[PDB]
Amino acid sequence: FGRDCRISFGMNGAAPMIRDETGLMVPFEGNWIFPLALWQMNTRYFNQQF
């Protein structure tokens, strides 16, 4: 993941997705890689979804 990490709520039961670095919408599962600065700029939001 990079500076652009937009999150989209899932609707009508679909799982929410977060934008990959290459630009593919992926669900909240598996193994991820974050730079620290990414969490810092979105602490409150991320600390609500994850």
Binding site: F9, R44, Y45, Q48
Partner: protein
């Protein structure tokens, strides 16, 4: 959409108004901080206002 999705719910300042409709209005020196006033301002109101 649940209220947790929107950015305003986290009290985050935005560069732009967060509204259903927004428009552009001319307002001379609406952000200036001058020492001498030239006293020739041109100010309109939003088009919903006459």
């Amino acid at each position: 959409l649940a209220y947790t999705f929107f950015t305003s719910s986290y009290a985050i300042q935005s560069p732009f108004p967060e509204a259903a409709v927004s428009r552009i209005v001319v307002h001379t020196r609406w952000a200036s901080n001058v020492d001498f006033d030239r006293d020739s301002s041109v100010i309109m109101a939003p088009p919903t206002e006459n």
